[PDB]
């Protein structure tokens, strides 16, 4: 089994997960919705349309009484029509972010770090931790993020499957999902990501690194103590491979979001801090 330190490391992680991850999205309300409606910048738009392109989603709002509101976004054309779902997303992302921040807070190993670092880490891992939480509510069978009463569905497009997979973000959710991971391994993934000793601004590199290794090691043992099936050989390695891919998708997504924010500002105050949105 796991050492007694390990066994309790997973517990504080799980506890933190349970106290800050509103898996039913019951406290997510008062959010915005789509209404009931020149050479340099030109190239910029061309890129934005390519950035928001295969991230297009449908929004469904199943109500208490049994009513069902459904929003199908506009197909590509003109301009502003490709930003109609951005304000709502900004509210989801912000709601998700607040949760992440809480998560890091109750974690004892995080609190014992210099606030500067605690910020560097949150700054450099939010999106990542957010993707890991969303994955738990992703239904790969229907390409839809089931978030309590509201759900986000993927819009089929050019090339279809093999095409969507060209979108790192999309591929990341489908491959991660394929690994059918436990809550314990998801929360360990979050910790390992949170304590990345290589994020910009991080001061105590040697300590954080010591911490990431501690978690990485717990995950590795956990997998051995709970999945000896020769089939699960390399599972730990597949996950680390995933975290690395996620870190790469996160770097691009930031650049992706800036390009968008540049053309059509939308980020919330908090998002601005987290993404360093210039002003």
């Amino acid at each position: 089994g796991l050492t007694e330190e390990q066994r309790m490391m997973i517990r504080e992680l799980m506890d933190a997960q349970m106290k800050t991850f509103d898996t039913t999205f019951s406290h997510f309300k008062n959010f915005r919705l789509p209404g009931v409606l020149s050479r340099e910048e030109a190239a910029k738009w061309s890129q934005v349309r390519k950035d928001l392109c295969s991230l297009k989603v449908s929004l469904q709002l199943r109500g208490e009484d049994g009513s069902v509101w459904n929003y199908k976004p506009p197909a590509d054309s003109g301009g502003k029509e490709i930003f109609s779902l951005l304000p709502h997303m900004a509210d989801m992302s912000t709601y998700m972010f607040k949760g992440i921040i809480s998560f890091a807070k109750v974690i004892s190993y995080f609190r014992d770090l210099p606030i500067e670092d605690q910020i560097s880490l949150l700054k450099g891992a939010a999106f990542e931790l957010s993707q890991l939480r969303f994955n738990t509510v992703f239904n790969a069978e229907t390409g839809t993020w089931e978030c309590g009463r509201l759900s986000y569905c993927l819009e089929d497009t050019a090339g279809g499957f093999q095409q969507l997979l060209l979108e790192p973000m999309l591929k990341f959710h489908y491959m991660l999902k394929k690994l059918q991971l436990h809550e314990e391994e998801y929360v360990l993934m979050q910790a390992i990501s949170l304590f990345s000793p290589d994020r910009p601004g991080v001061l105590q590199h040697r300590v954080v690194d010591q911490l990431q290794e501690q978690f990485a090691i717990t995950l590795k043992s956990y997998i051995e103590c709970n999945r000896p099936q020769p089939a699960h050989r390399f599972l730990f390695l597949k996950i680390m491979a995933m975290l690395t891919e996620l870190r790469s998708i996160n770097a691009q997504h930031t650049q992706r979001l800036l390009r968008i924010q540049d053309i059509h500002p939308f980020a919330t105050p908090l998002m601005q801090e987290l993404f360093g949105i210039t002003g």
Partner: peptide, 15 residues
């Protein structure tokens, strides 16, 4: 400051 450039985030860090 890094703290000074993250009001809310920091503001959220203590409660």
């Amino acid at each position: 400051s890094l703290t000074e450039r993250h009001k809310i985030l920091h503001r959220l860090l203590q409660e």
